[PDB]
Design a binder for this molecule. Structure first.
Ligand SMILES: CC(C)[C@H](CO)Nc1nc(N[C@H]2CCN(S(C)(=O)=O)C2)c2ncn(C(C)C)c2n1
Length: 277
């Protein structure tokens, strides 16, 4: 009431659409009901890029943290559902993947990881842009497992930039096929869905995997499927890029900067989506 409608529930709290009393601007206010996290989150006010949802302010009051963001009108999950009968056109999938890779390459260059990328934290506007929301929040602080990289599911506690490339690969596949790639409903179901598609990992494709905290020698041994079966009708360039984003070994997975130079983006453009708001 001093300085200012519910949108829904997010990973760290409730998000509201609100009007700033001093400026008249419409913003998204995220209330995180609860000192190290305050300094860390406050530093993200400097992590500004056209493909990163702007964090305007970080307020600590009455033992609660409020994050004030730029407001966007739709998320990618709602846009994919709106497009379920025809699919998103390939040039717009390409544009959105390219823009998300630019946003990741910027954050990764500043050593900031997301760790929890998913369609609900990718927001779009009427000008053809897509933006990443919530970078840096996981480090400072049902939850979907569908986009979680296999090193996280296998108990590695040292995250690298590769976890975000894996999640983006999963989202890319879901834009093309109109279905989630690995819709697990438990940690083991998530792992076994990844293993049934990509094959059970072993020391040949992922050195050190058998020494991971949650690796079990008793995991079933599935053979790998071809990407031509997984994401039809994506062309050879797109399937090659997806295969590099879903390598098991996080050291082998393509970086966001290298992905921007992939042949799949030779003809990239920026189409304008028709949005129904
Ligand atoms: C509660 C959810 C997690 C939601 C995403 O569905 N969060 C959300 N929504 C925003 N805008 C909504 C407006 C209506 N659409 S929708 C639900 O119809 O797709 C998106 C939004 N603008 C900026 N931010 C910041 C905090 C990252 C936002 N965070």
């Amino acid at each position: 009431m001093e300085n200012f409608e519910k949108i829904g529930e997010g990973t760290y709290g409730v998000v509201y659409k609100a009007r700033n009393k001093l400026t008249g601007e419409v913003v998204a206010l995220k209330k995180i009901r609860l000192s190290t996290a305050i300094r860390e989150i406050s530093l993200l006010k400097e992590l500004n890029h056209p493909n990163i949802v702007k964090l305007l302010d970080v307020i600590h009051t009455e033992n609660k943290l409020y994050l004030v963001f730029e407001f966007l009108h739709q998320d990618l999950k709602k846009f994919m559902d709106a497009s379920a009968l025809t699919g998103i056109p390939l040039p717009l999938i390409k544009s959105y993947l390219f823009q998300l890779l630019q946003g990741l390459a910027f954050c990764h260059s500043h050593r900031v990881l997301h760790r929890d990328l998913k369609p609900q934290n990718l927001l779009i506007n009427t000008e053809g842009a897509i933006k990443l929301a919530d970078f840096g929040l996981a480090r400072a602080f049902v939850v979907t497992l569908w986009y979680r990289a296999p090193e996280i599911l296998l108990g590695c506690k040292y995250y690298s930039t590769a976890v975000d490339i894996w999640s983006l690969g999963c989202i890319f596949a879901e834009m093309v096929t109109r279905r989630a790639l690995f819709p697990g409903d438990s940690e083991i179901d998530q792992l076994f869905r990844i293993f049934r598609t990509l094959g059970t990992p072993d020391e040949v494709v992922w050195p050190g995997v058998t020494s991971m905290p949650d690796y079990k020698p008793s995991f079933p041994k599935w053979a790998r499927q071809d990407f031509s079966k997984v994401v039809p009708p994506l062309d050879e360039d797109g399937r090659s890029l997806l295969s590099q984003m879903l390598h098991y070994d996080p050291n082998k997975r393509i970086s966001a900067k290298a992905a921007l130079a992939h042949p799949f983006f030779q003809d990239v453009t920026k189409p304008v989506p028709h949005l129904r708001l």
